[PDB]
């Protein structure tokens, strides 16, 4: 959509050069072997590697020199939004399933409210491993009809 | 004996009650033919006034 | 003044009568409950509307209800 | 939000939220309650003072160090 | 029946002609809906059966492929309005009367067997028309007979792999 | 009975609450003493007449003051280098430097520059001199007098309409559709053809000669013979100068599309055709319903027969006709929703497709009209939801509407409310997170780490409309498509030329900042809807207060029992939603103003680069553009922007004053007034004077209303001052 | 090119269709839906003295009951279509 790749972005190169020039301005103030100078020299390399990696991944830059993210579902940009999205969904489902399974276990007690303050660690440690298979567990429970009260 | 047997589980049908469509345990029922709300029910959840006991009529209680 | 109404879900525990700071309510005999009594509101012209009576009713919903209405000197709590 | 508003609205909102939680058997045994009348006042003034004092602090410190 | 091992819906007992207990969506629960759907299905079957040879015959006779007006509008509107004016549920699906001078309604069992055969052939013709319509999209400007000839060139397979996976 | 005479309860009140509540409850006809349905309807009729009387008077003042103290004749000659004048200034407090500083335009004294855009509208519709404005003012005065006379006459006992006349819904719809909407548009087309177009082509048509001038050389011949194409031949040339005959055509009904090259507004021959088509459609649509002539539809049977056979909607629409007809708050709620939607649409369309000559080059006028009509829409929407809640409280009858769509609405209110909560939380969480991430990333000196997301879907829509700034090549942007070939020879060239001109506001270019601000707007809309819908659905009662319907629409609270019941009435849900409405409209107007000012300055890259983090908004928009406004008066002197600085400070003061009513509550002030009353009573030479009504503090509900009024007034005045000062300090 | 005076034979065809083929259908729906009502009563019997149906205009001597109202309703359709053909052509 009028976007150019990072590796061929003159404004991207200008941003990198300007940041490096600004960083090197403070390097001249200290002795070359001093600890502040050693710490500063490690910052320039980090900037260089970051810019190289951004160029190497085929990110798209506009007229500003800043990368843009395409989330329409293009197969060449699945790492921007699609790939991290499924990971977040899996992790959030794990957390939710563990939290839901803990409450059901203690609901049958005489005083279920007491277990919400003093957490039963031996009981909680067993349920934690069970969240690994939460997609299959939820898929099977939905079909059987036990998901909704 | 008039009313549901004590110890049973009952469902509340009163519209304005905090425990509408909830299940409670019968504590006692009054055998006096003049009492208007003899059935005494006890609930696990307290209402907004921190009370878990209330009296209901015969037609406000459904036996589950 | 305000309007105070008493309904038949009363159990006659006498808390509202003790909570009134203006002597509006009183208890009368009534064979409709175990306590054989029910509350009454004969002097509603002295009610100020502080609703201390409703904070004392223990039923699922209040057996004593206060509805605010035309306000006078007595119901405004004015001393000047 | 705490200074301008009241307690009944939030209790009713929490009622709807609790219904949606009950629908999926994730209803906590400790019934959620909105903050009391006195607590809602105390929360508002704390944030008010914190925000004002922090704004003035940052403004003064950034201005006077530079010049 | 439609697929063995599946319980049939209560409203499809296998007594109706052409019935095979097919309703994965359950769109025929209401009796009035079932009568309307029966009539609509019959009309669709008859029209498709009347139409398909009129599409095929051109290409076979070499006159071309399948790819006054006021009189036509008047006639069709009048015919459809007059059909809609009928009130009997049974006469709408089968009008009989003088419309069948050949008298093929004399025998009851033969009548029912004819009804089943007509329903089956109507479903087949409807599927054939859907096939024609989808075929025209894949190969524009090519009639079905030319497609059959191209299949005769390579009688191996229904050439969907050339389309589904380009 | 002394005051108010319509309420006995308030008349007996011995305190100052009597006056306040007499003022506040004056127009609530349903709560007055000894009211009836007939009396209520007749009062509403008379009130509507009185309202129509005031609109015609307000319009006449503008015309009279422009004609008497304006420079309309001078502005017409050179529209692009003259400042419109609203009225004159006569203030005895003025100093000598202020008298000379405000003397602008061709006037000989202090004047006010008009930002309402009436000069352009009147110029476009055919007025050219002051005598026309005077005649218009006289006619509007006559109309106002006629409205007042009609109202008085229909308030008389002999001419009082009956209740059954007002409930005749089928006859009213026929007359309002065909007569009010169709004939009016037809008459406006007749005006445009007869007067407006010949005036735009250099010919003067007035009352004394319009019966001797043919609007078209061929007259009415082509219309009856069916040769309607002769009315579109020889259209206006692209070199035409507005108001002069150079390059003018002879067509009266065209479908060119695009903009006039000189005025940058829609062609005058397109408006005539558009209004003709609209008038014909509305005239045809007005014969649907049944009247005394034995043909048509009945709305009662139309609703009753739309019931899905599956039973997934209950009984369907049964009983809704009487529910709508017998309830007046239901009628008012439906009018306000449509009015708000079309007001928003007007605001969105008037800035991108200007209709008036020489209004696209007036930068202050165009920014004021968008902010004016967008703030009104929010208030109308809040009113629609408030009157829906009032209807649910008052007019709803559960037995009549059993198991229809309304009962099923009330049945599952918990599911609707809990989902708007999820949508609002999701939007707010993620929008704030992205904004803060960008803020931190740029604060640490590494702007290349920002999360910038291109709004691909809106860009695709723009490309499908014919914009070629993205290269998607879809639909109208594709020359080989079926869509392009259909209209290539009717309207496509002009529209395509106009849309690809990047100097106007037709489908501007968008980026990540537009994405973020659009999602902020969506969050605001969802949250305001959530508050209003929760109030409306919980108006009848909830678990905390099952019998809320017995206490009316507005009441203070239900005491401190059961944990506390502040702000529990349905009136308090409306009062909370006004803050969110103001916040959302503020976001919308901030976005519009910054984008357009950056476009006008020629440095559109500044918005494209700074809008993505929250420090850019505060530094490059508010701090940067308020430099000229606060310099209205300084220790050295003053200029013509001093009034806007004074308005700025005045709005700040009122907004800050509203906080006192919103935060501090009643019990403190009554205890203060006790001591004040004692002190007055025990003072020599001053206790000879006595009050007649005892002083008391403001009621619980009244204070919320007062604080809200202060808050809103300060908000509006401050933003108006800032907007006008910033936009007119650079472009005039 | 047939002119404006001849193409308006569409009015004749519309009147023919209104009286002979579409007459029965229109009368059935009119009686099925009936007069508009407010609170279970028609507009005239509820008090509105200007909502009484006109029966003098409905009195017709036609064998099937064709009326001037139906004449106007069915002839208005013919003129609209006639001008649609005259306008769509000659572009
Ligand atoms: C594990 C517990 C748990 C689960 C399964 C849910 C599930 C749900 N909540 Mg929820 N909620 C929770 C805890 C939980 N909540 C807590 C503790 C709070 C108070 C902070 C809320 C406050 C809340 C609101 C205000 C709303 C929901 C809503 C919802 C529903 C929409 C989906 C969603 O994620 O909303 C988003 C949920 C959140 C943003 C909550 C934050 C997540 C918390 C921090 C996780 C806490 C986990 C806890 C420590 C478990 C410990 C387990 C351990 C013993 C092993 C969904 C059914 C929405 C709805 O549909 O209406 C009811 C809604 O509007 N929730
Ligand atoms: C309802 C069914 C139906 C319909 C809509 C049509 C429609 C058409 N047919 Mg046709 N046709 C039909 C049944 C139908 N046919 C049947 C059953 C036969 C077998 C006898 C034919 C045999 C036939 C021939 C041999 C030819 C047509 C042709 C045509 C086309 C115009 C000229 C014509 O003959 O007038 C319409 C005729 C009958 C309705 C027209 C699209 C002609 C053509 O190819 O034009 C494109 C042509 O040469 N048809
Ligand atoms: C707006 C408005 C509306 C809705 C009405 C409505 C009405 N007026 Mg009215 N009126 C208005 C403004 C309005 N007026 C104004 C501004 C004035 C001042 C000039 C009057 C002066 C006025 C008088 C003096 C009278 C009415 C009367 C009437 C009633 C019967 C007349 C009628 O509608 O039959 C119209 C019927 C027609 C067939 C007209 C069709 C139009 C043809 C084709 C021309 C009717 C309720 C009369 C009455 O008795 O009221 C109870 C009556 O005597 N009006
Ligand atoms: C031809 C018949 C006719 C006409 C013209 C009217 C006209 C009117 N009636 Mg009415 N009425 C009629 C028959 C008619 N009635 C009949 C038969 C009945 C009995 C069934 C009634 C019963 C009745 C009642 C009970 C009431 C009215 C009222 C009104 C007035 C409402 C004002 C209005 O709509 O704003 C005019 C609105 C528009 C023209 C359209 C606004 C919306 C559009 C979409 C906006 C378009 C704007 C456009 C872009 C131009 C703006 C730009 C510009 C600023 C430059 C209006 C004068 C009300 C009243 O009393 O008013 C005094 C009222 O209460 N009528
Ligand atoms: C077509 C426009 C229209 C009309 C005819 C009405 C008519 C009415 N409204 Mg209303 N309203 C509207 C738009 C409208 N509203 C909008 C847009 C909003 C949202 C801001 C509201 C918000 C609103 C509220 C919150 C309330 C009403 C109420 C009322 C009723 C009594 C009015 C009253 O006492 O005010 C008398 C006049 C004043 C109080 C002067 C106020 C001046 C303010 C402070 C600033 C000027 C009356 C039927 C009241 C009602 O029905 O109570 C049961 C009520 O409580 N309205
Ligand atoms: C800047 C002020 C402000 C803010 C941030 C909010 C925010 C919110 N309001 Mg709100 N409101 C405000 C002013 C504000 N309001 C005012 C002035 C009024 C008028 C009185 C209202 C009236 C109002 C109503 C009537 C309603 C809301 C609701 C909401 C919530 C829904 C919006 C959303 O998406 O949540 C986004 C969430 C956030 C912005 C919270 C972010 C906080 C972060 C994540 C915490 C980070 C962790 C923390 C720092 C660690 C703790 C450290 C320790 C030292 C404390 C949201 C929390 C609605 C609600 O609650 O229903 C859902 C609702 O119904 N508001
Ligand atoms: C929901 C909002 C949201 C989202 C989606 C993200 C997403 C991200 N943040 Mg982030 N962030 C947020 C809010 C958010 N942040 C807020 C509110 C803060 C302020 C406390 C930060 C402060 C922050 C820092 C300081 C850093 C990130 C970084 C990142 C990236 C981490 C990549 C990785 O490997 O891990 C990721 C794109 C890291 C990065 O390199 O981004 C490119 C990083 O160093 N974030
Ligand atoms: C900017 C907002 C604002 C303003 C102006 C005020 C003003 C005031 N507050 Mg206050 N307050 C505020 C916000 C504000 N408060 C907030 C947010 C809170 C927290 C809830 C409080 C809490 C608070 C408390 C708790 C108390 C006050 C009190 C007072 C009064 C102090 C005594 C006095 O007369 O002062 C002098 C008055 C002024 C400075 C205002 C007038 C300014 C100019 C001179 C107006 C001149 C206009 C002139 C008459 C011409 C008008 C003519 C007309 C035709 C237009 C004063 C009126 C106290 C009180 O009751 O009095 C003892 C008190 O006890 N306030
Ligand atoms: C396999 C997984 C489920 C697949 C189907 C999911 C959808 C549910 C079934 C729809 C199958 C179906 O036809 O359902 C029909 C059903 C009921 O329709 P009616 O009540 O109008 O008619 C019922 C009669 O057809 C019964 O004979 O729902 C609808 O009205 C349509 C809802 C979607 C409307 C979408 C368009 C809206 C414009
Ligand atoms: C053609 C076209 C189109 C279309 C579109 C559309 C179709 C849209 C729609 C839209 C819509 C569709 C909207 C809506 C809205 C809504 C609203 C705004 C609502 C409101 C509501 C309310 C206000 C309520 C009230 C109430 C209540 C609450 C209760 C009681 C009752 C009542 C009613 C009163 C498009 C553009 C695509 C494209 C181009 C062309
Ligand atoms: S409202 Fe207060 S004064 Fe009135 S009866 Fe109740 S407790 Fe007594
Ligand atoms: S009003 Fe309440 S407290 Fe008083 S007797 Fe009745 S139930 Fe008891």
mmCIF file with all atom_site columns, N, CA and C in Angstrom, chain F residues 124-161:
data_model
loop_
_atom_site.group_PDB
_atom_site.id
_atom_site.type_symbol
_atom_site.label_atom_id
_atom_site.label_alt_id
_atom_site.label_comp_id
_atom_site.label_asym_id
_atom_site.label_entity_id
_atom_site.label_seq_id
_atom_site.pdbx_PDB_ins_code
_atom_site.Cartn_x
_atom_site.Cartn_y
_atom_site.Cartn_z
_atom_site.occupancy
_atom_site.B_iso_or_equiv
_atom_site.pdbx_formal_charge
_atom_site.auth_seq_id
_atom_site.auth_comp_id
_atom_site.auth_asym_id
_atom_site.auth_atom_id
_atom_site.pdbx_PDB_model_num
ATOM 1   N N  . UNK F 1 124 ? -25.190 32.114 -2.488 1.00 0.00 ? 124 UNK F N  1
ATOM 2   C CA . UNK F 1 124 ? -25.458 30.982 -3.367 1.00 0.00 ? 124 UNK F CA 1
ATOM 3   C C  . UNK F 1 124 ? -26.926 30.917 -3.766 1.00 0.00 ? 124 UNK F C  1
ATOM 4   N N  . UNK F 1 125 ? -27.846 31.164 -2.825 1.00 0.00 ? 125 UNK F N  1
ATOM 5   C CA . UNK F 1 125 ? -29.263 30.977 -3.134 1.00 0.00 ? 125 UNK F CA 1
ATOM 6   C C  . UNK F 1 125 ? -29.869 32.126 -3.925 1.00 0.00 ? 125 UNK F C  1
ATOM 7   N N  . UNK F 1 126 ? -29.094 33.148 -4.274 1.00 0.00 ? 126 UNK F N  1
ATOM 8   C CA . UNK F 1 126 ? -29.544 34.150 -5.227 1.00 0.00 ? 126 UNK F CA 1
ATOM 9   C C  . UNK F 1 126 ? -29.671 35.570 -4.711 1.00 0.00 ? 126 UNK F C  1
ATOM 10  N N  . UNK F 1 127 ? -29.486 35.849 -3.424 1.00 0.00 ? 127 UNK F N  1
ATOM 11  C CA . UNK F 1 127 ? -29.577 37.218 -2.933 1.00 0.00 ? 127 UNK F CA 1
ATOM 12  C C  . UNK F 1 127 ? -28.321 37.997 -3.299 1.00 0.00 ? 127 UNK F C  1
ATOM 13  N N  . UNK F 1 128 ? -28.495 39.273 -3.649 1.00 0.00 ? 128 UNK F N  1
ATOM 14  C CA . UNK F 1 128 ? -27.375 40.099 -4.087 1.00 0.00 ? 128 UNK F CA 1
ATOM 15  C C  . UNK F 1 128 ? -27.301 41.481 -3.451 1.00 0.00 ? 128 UNK F C  1
ATOM 16  N N  . UNK F 1 129 ? -28.393 42.023 -2.917 1.00 0.00 ? 129 UNK F N  1
ATOM 17  C CA . UNK F 1 129 ? -28.402 43.368 -2.355 1.00 0.00 ? 129 UNK F CA 1
ATOM 18  C C  . UNK F 1 129 ? -29.038 43.343 -0.970 1.00 0.00 ? 129 UNK F C  1
ATOM 19  N N  . UNK F 1 130 ? -29.057 44.509 -0.317 1.00 0.00 ? 130 UNK F N  1
ATOM 20  C CA . UNK F 1 130 ? -29.616 44.615 1.027  1.00 0.00 ? 130 UNK F CA 1
ATOM 21  C C  . UNK F 1 130 ? -31.139 44.616 1.027  1.00 0.00 ? 130 UNK F C  1
ATOM 22  N N  . UNK F 1 131 ? -31.759 45.123 -0.041 1.00 0.00 ? 131 UNK F N  1
ATOM 23  C CA . UNK F 1 131 ? -33.216 45.156 -0.099 1.00 0.00 ? 131 UNK F CA 1
ATOM 24  C C  . UNK F 1 131 ? -33.807 43.755 -0.032 1.00 0.00 ? 131 UNK F C  1
ATOM 25  N N  . UNK F 1 132 ? -33.122 42.771 -0.618 1.00 0.00 ? 132 UNK F N  1
ATOM 26  C CA . UNK F 1 132 ? -33.578 41.390 -0.520 1.00 0.00 ? 132 UNK F CA 1
ATOM 27  C C  . UNK F 1 132 ? -33.569 40.909 0.925  1.00 0.00 ? 132 UNK F C  1
ATOM 28  N N  . UNK F 1 133 ? -32.522 41.258 1.676  1.00 0.00 ? 133 UNK F N  1
ATOM 29  C CA . UNK F 1 133 ? -32.462 40.880 3.084  1.00 0.00 ? 133 UNK F CA 1
ATOM 30  C C  . UNK F 1 133 ? -33.571 41.553 3.885  1.00 0.00 ? 133 UNK F C  1
ATOM 31  N N  . UNK F 1 134 ? -33.849 42.826 3.596  1.00 0.00 ? 134 UNK F N  1
ATOM 32  C CA . UNK F 1 134 ? -34.936 43.514 4.289  1.00 0.00 ? 134 UNK F CA 1
ATOM 33  C C  . UNK F 1 134 ? -36.283 42.858 4.000  1.00 0.00 ? 134 UNK F C  1
ATOM 34  N N  . UNK F 1 135 ? -36.522 42.489 2.739  1.00 0.00 ? 135 UNK F N  1
ATOM 35  C CA . UNK F 1 135 ? -37.772 41.819 2.393  1.00 0.00 ? 135 UNK F CA 1
ATOM 36  C C  . UNK F 1 135 ? -37.890 40.473 3.097  1.00 0.00 ? 135 UNK F C  1
ATOM 37  N N  . UNK F 1 136 ? -36.792 39.717 3.158  1.00 0.00 ? 136 UNK F N  1
ATOM 38  C CA . UNK F 1 136 ? -36.817 38.457 3.883  1.00 0.00 ? 136 UNK F CA 1
ATOM 39  C C  . UNK F 1 136 ? -37.131 38.639 5.355  1.00 0.00 ? 136 UNK F C  1
ATOM 40  N N  . UNK F 1 137 ? -36.547 39.667 5.977  1.00 0.00 ? 137 UNK F N  1
ATOM 41  C CA . UNK F 1 137 ? -36.826 39.933 7.384  1.00 0.00 ? 137 UNK F CA 1
ATOM 42  C C  . UNK F 1 137 ? -38.298 40.264 7.605  1.00 0.00 ? 137 UNK F C  1
ATOM 43  N N  . UNK F 1 138 ? -38.874 41.094 6.734  1.00 0.00 ? 138 UNK F N  1
ATOM 44  C CA . UNK F 1 138 ? -40.288 41.432 6.875  1.00 0.00 ? 138 UNK F CA 1
ATOM 45  C C  . UNK F 1 138 ? -41.170 40.196 6.728  1.00 0.00 ? 138 UNK F C  1
ATOM 46  N N  . UNK F 1 139 ? -40.860 39.344 5.747  1.00 0.00 ? 139 UNK F N  1
ATOM 47  C CA . UNK F 1 139 ? -41.646 38.128 5.552  1.00 0.00 ? 139 UNK F CA 1
ATOM 48  C C  . UNK F 1 139 ? -41.562 37.211 6.768  1.00 0.00 ? 139 UNK F C  1
ATOM 49  N N  . UNK F 1 140 ? -40.371 37.078 7.356  1.00 0.00 ? 140 UNK F N  1
ATOM 50  C CA . UNK F 1 140 ? -40.235 36.217 8.526  1.00 0.00 ? 140 UNK F CA 1
ATOM 51  C C  . UNK F 1 140 ? -40.986 36.780 9.729  1.00 0.00 ? 140 UNK F C  1
ATOM 52  N N  . UNK F 1 141 ? -41.010 38.106 9.881  1.00 0.00 ? 141 UNK F N  1
ATOM 53  C CA . UNK F 1 141 ? -41.827 38.696 10.939 1.00 0.00 ? 141 UNK F CA 1
ATOM 54  C C  . UNK F 1 141 ? -43.303 38.364 10.742 1.00 0.00 ? 141 UNK F C  1
ATOM 55  N N  . UNK F 1 142 ? -43.778 38.446 9.497  1.00 0.00 ? 142 UNK F N  1
ATOM 56  C CA . UNK F 1 142 ? -45.164 38.077 9.219  1.00 0.00 ? 142 UNK F CA 1
ATOM 57  C C  . UNK F 1 142 ? -45.426 36.619 9.583  1.00 0.00 ? 142 UNK F C  1
ATOM 58  N N  . UNK F 1 143 ? -44.488 35.729 9.251  1.00 0.00 ? 143 UNK F N  1
ATOM 59  C CA . UNK F 1 143 ? -44.659 34.311 9.569  1.00 0.00 ? 143 UNK F CA 1
ATOM 60  C C  . UNK F 1 143 ? -44.711 34.075 11.075 1.00 0.00 ? 143 UNK F C  1
ATOM 61  N N  . UNK F 1 144 ? -43.860 34.769 11.834 1.00 0.00 ? 144 UNK F N  1
ATOM 62  C CA . UNK F 1 144 ? -43.884 34.630 13.287 1.00 0.00 ? 144 UNK F CA 1
ATOM 63  C C  . UNK F 1 144 ? -45.229 35.064 13.861 1.00 0.00 ? 144 UNK F C  1
ATOM 64  N N  . UNK F 1 145 ? -45.748 36.200 13.388 1.00 0.00 ? 145 UNK F N  1
ATOM 65  C CA . UNK F 1 145 ? -47.059 36.648 13.848 1.00 0.00 ? 145 UNK F CA 1
ATOM 66  C C  . UNK F 1 145 ? -48.141 35.632 13.500 1.00 0.00 ? 145 UNK F C  1
ATOM 67  N N  . UNK F 1 146 ? -48.065 35.049 12.300 1.00 0.00 ? 146 UNK F N  1
ATOM 68  C CA . UNK F 1 146 ? -49.050 34.048 11.900 1.00 0.00 ? 146 UNK F CA 1
ATOM 69  C C  . UNK F 1 146 ? -49.008 32.827 12.810 1.00 0.00 ? 146 UNK F C  1
ATOM 70  N N  . UNK F 1 147 ? -47.806 32.362 13.158 1.00 0.00 ? 147 UNK F N  1
ATOM 71  C CA . UNK F 1 147 ? -47.694 31.215 14.057 1.00 0.00 ? 147 UNK F CA 1
ATOM 72  C C  . UNK F 1 147 ? -48.316 31.518 15.415 1.00 0.00 ? 147 UNK F C  1
ATOM 73  N N  . UNK F 1 148 ? -48.019 32.697 15.967 1.00 0.00 ? 148 UNK F N  1
ATOM 74  C CA . UNK F 1 148 ? -48.590 33.049 17.267 1.00 0.00 ? 148 UNK F CA 1
ATOM 75  C C  . UNK F 1 148 ? -50.112 33.106 17.205 1.00 0.00 ? 148 UNK F C  1
ATOM 76  N N  . UNK F 1 149 ? -50.655 33.708 16.143 1.00 0.00 ? 149 UNK F N  1
ATOM 77  C CA . UNK F 1 149 ? -52.105 33.819 16.008 1.00 0.00 ? 149 UNK F CA 1
ATOM 78  C C  . UNK F 1 149 ? -52.737 32.438 15.905 1.00 0.00 ? 149 UNK F C  1
ATOM 79  N N  . UNK F 1 150 ? -52.127 31.544 15.125 1.00 0.00 ? 150 UNK F N  1
ATOM 80  C CA . UNK F 1 150 ? -52.660 30.197 15.009 1.00 0.00 ? 150 UNK F CA 1
ATOM 81  C C  . UNK F 1 150 ? -52.668 29.456 16.331 1.00 0.00 ? 150 UNK F C  1
ATOM 82  N N  . UNK F 1 151 ? -51.589 29.587 17.106 1.00 0.00 ? 151 UNK F N  1
ATOM 83  C CA . UNK F 1 151 ? -51.556 28.947 18.414 1.00 0.00 ? 151 UNK F CA 1
ATOM 84  C C  . UNK F 1 151 ? -52.644 29.459 19.339 1.00 0.00 ? 151 UNK F C  1
ATOM 85  N N  . UNK F 1 152 ? -52.800 30.786 19.403 1.00 0.00 ? 152 UNK F N  1
ATOM 86  C CA . UNK F 1 152 ? -53.852 31.345 20.246 1.00 0.00 ? 152 UNK F CA 1
ATOM 87  C C  . UNK F 1 152 ? -55.226 30.870 19.797 1.00 0.00 ? 152 UNK F C  1
ATOM 88  N N  . UNK F 1 153 ? -55.472 30.865 18.485 1.00 0.00 ? 153 UNK F N  1
ATOM 89  C CA . UNK F 1 153 ? -56.776 30.455 17.974 1.00 0.00 ? 153 UNK F CA 1
ATOM 90  C C  . UNK F 1 153 ? -57.069 28.998 18.298 1.00 0.00 ? 153 UNK F C  1
ATOM 91  N N  . UNK F 1 154 ? -56.064 28.128 18.216 1.00 0.00 ? 154 UNK F N  1
ATOM 92  C CA . UNK F 1 154 ? -56.284 26.726 18.542 1.00 0.00 ? 154 UNK F CA 1
ATOM 93  C C  . UNK F 1 154 ? -56.275 26.452 20.039 1.00 0.00 ? 154 UNK F C  1
ATOM 94  N N  . UNK F 1 155 ? -55.958 27.442 20.870 1.00 0.00 ? 155 UNK F N  1
ATOM 95  C CA . UNK F 1 155 ? -56.160 27.291 22.307 1.00 0.00 ? 155 UNK F CA 1
ATOM 96  C C  . UNK F 1 155 ? -57.566 27.674 22.762 1.00 0.00 ? 155 UNK F C  1
ATOM 97  N N  . UNK F 1 156 ? -58.426 28.151 21.858 1.00 0.00 ? 156 UNK F N  1
ATOM 98  C CA . UNK F 1 156 ? -59.773 28.572 22.218 1.00 0.00 ? 156 UNK F CA 1
ATOM 99  C C  . UNK F 1 156 ? -60.699 27.367 22.385 1.00 0.00 ? 156 UNK F C  1
ATOM 100 N N  . UNK F 1 157 ? -61.748 27.496 23.204 1.00 0.00 ? 157 UNK F N  1
ATOM 101 C CA . UNK F 1 157 ? -62.635 26.346 23.447 1.00 0.00 ? 157 UNK F CA 1
ATOM 102 C C  . UNK F 1 157 ? -63.334 25.819 22.205 1.00 0.00 ? 157 UNK F C  1
ATOM 103 N N  . UNK F 1 158 ? -63.677 26.686 21.254 1.00 0.00 ? 158 UNK F N  1
ATOM 104 C CA . UNK F 1 158 ? -64.442 26.246 20.093 1.00 0.00 ? 158 UNK F CA 1
ATOM 105 C C  . UNK F 1 158 ? -63.585 25.488 19.085 1.00 0.00 ? 158 UNK F C  1
ATOM 106 N N  . UNK F 1 159 ? -62.279 25.759 19.043 1.00 0.00 ? 159 UNK F N  1
ATOM 107 C CA . UNK F 1 159 ? -61.384 25.167 18.056 1.00 0.00 ? 159 UNK F CA 1
ATOM 108 C C  . UNK F 1 159 ? -60.442 24.132 18.661 1.00 0.00 ? 159 UNK F C  1
ATOM 109 N N  . UNK F 1 160 ? -60.795 23.556 19.802 1.00 0.00 ? 160 UNK F N  1
ATOM 110 C CA . UNK F 1 160 ? -59.927 22.584 20.458 1.00 0.00 ? 160 UNK F CA 1
ATOM 111 C C  . UNK F 1 160 ? -60.046 21.225 19.780 1.00 0.00 ? 160 UNK F C  1
ATOM 112 N N  . UNK F 1 161 ? -58.959 20.657 19.268 1.00 0.00 ? 161 UNK F N  1
ATOM 113 C CA . UNK F 1 161 ? -59.034 19.316 18.679 1.00 0.00 ? 161 UNK F CA 1
ATOM 114 C C  . UNK F 1 161 ? -59.236 18.251 19.747 1.00 0.00 ? 161 UNK F C  1
#
